[PDB]
Design a protein around this ligand. Structure first.
Ligand SMILES: Cc1ccc2c(c1)nc(CCc1coc3ccc(Cl)cc3c1=O)n2-c1ccccc1
Ligand SMILES: [Mg+2]
Ligand SMILES: [Zn+2]
Length: 310
């Protein structure tokens, strides 16, 4: 609670390319700041917000990427978006989505969904698809229910089971698998013109690309930030290969450390089939979010430079 943000950062936070990298002591305080800026200071009672942000944090684990730094970075990109699109997302929405971004990878083990299903893993036995995603939501609801943690208490029960729904939904949308379709349908509603923010399930579709665009925002940071975030990402994937190898199974080339050489090519393919389309359809639906796609291009061409050896 006692925290105040080094007033020097007040403008640099509102950047789409801000990097929370150097400021780890401040990561819990930043989120609060981003909450306070959006839904006001007296949105949640200050005391039950700190319990919450702090429980949440402890339930992120020591893994290379799907960690506490990751989550807060996702909450940051959602912050930026919600602000650069101020009068177009309801009171409750801005409450739901920042919490959801902060929680959308709770208790992440560091292993893919495909891993947990290839090997009949207990969580995959619980959740038949979006194995972690539903667990991330399962963790979120669980932690709300702790004595003195239910920040959504003074919402009417009805608004309270709308928050949740946004949160469950927005967390499930982070399964890339679902991303591809969700973005295709949105590319058609735009072409067609039949996309209508009044209709609830178009918003849910837009929220989901908003969730994806946040999830991938490390691709939208400054090149020396992004280059050193990628190391975090593969570190994990290559662990997930190291376990696939230990059984005498060849991992996919994405998760194989023996092919570190091929990563520049691999990154570049990723931006062209995932990142760039995501921020393109997003910028078509939320024009102010063009800085993400602008920095996504910039970063992409950096990998092209590294492929071409410059
Ligand atoms: C040898 C090799 C072959 C394929 C490769 C690769 C290396 N690296 C990749 C990309 C790996 C990858 C996967 O998920 C992400 C999620 C979020 C963010 Cl910010 C970045 C990534 C990311 O970099 N692919 C890949 C390419 C296209 C689609 C999917 C993965
Ligand atoms: Mg996840
Ligand atoms: Zn994520």
């Amino acid at each position: 609670m006692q925290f105040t943000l080094p007033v020097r950062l007040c403008k640099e936070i509102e950047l789409f390319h801000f990097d929370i990298g150097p400021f780890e002591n401040m990561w819990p305080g930043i989120f609060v700041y981003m909450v306070h800026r959006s839904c006001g200071t007296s949105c949640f009672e200050l005391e039950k917000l700190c319990r919450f942000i702090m429980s949440v944090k402890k339930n992120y684990r020591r893994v290379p990427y799907h960690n506490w730094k990751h989550a807060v970075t996702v909450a940051h990109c959602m912050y930026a978006i919600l602000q650069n699109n101020h009068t177009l997302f309801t009171d409750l929405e801005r409450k739901g989505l920042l919490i959801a971004c902060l929680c959308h990878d709770l208790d992440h083990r560091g292993f893919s969904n495909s891993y947990l299903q290839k090997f009949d893993h207990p969580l995959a036995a619980l959740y038949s698809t979006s194995t972690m995603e539903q667990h991330h939501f399962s963790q979120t609801v669980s932690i709300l229910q702790l004595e003195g943690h239910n920040i959504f208490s003074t919402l009417s029960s009805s608004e309270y089971e709308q928050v949740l729904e946004i949160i469950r939904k927005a967390i499930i949308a982070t399964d890339l698998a679902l991303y591809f379709g969700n973005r295709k349908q949105l590319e058609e509603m735009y072409q067609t013109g039949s996309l209508n923010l009044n209709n609830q399930s178009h918003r849910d579709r837009v929220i989901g690309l908003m969730m994806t665009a946040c999830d991938l925002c490390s691709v939208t940071k400054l090149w020396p930030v992004t280059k050193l975030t990628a190391n975090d990402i593969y570190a994990e994937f290559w662990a997930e290969g190291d376990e696939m190898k230990k059984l005498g199974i060849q991992p996919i080339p994405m998760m194989d450390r023996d092919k570190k050489d091929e990563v520049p090519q691999g990154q570049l393919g990723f931006y062209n089939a995932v990142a760039i389309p995501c921020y393109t359809t997003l910028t078509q639906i939320l024009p102010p979010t063009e800085p993400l796609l602008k920095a996504c291009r910039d970063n992409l061409s950096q990998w092209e430079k590294v492929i071409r050896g410059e």
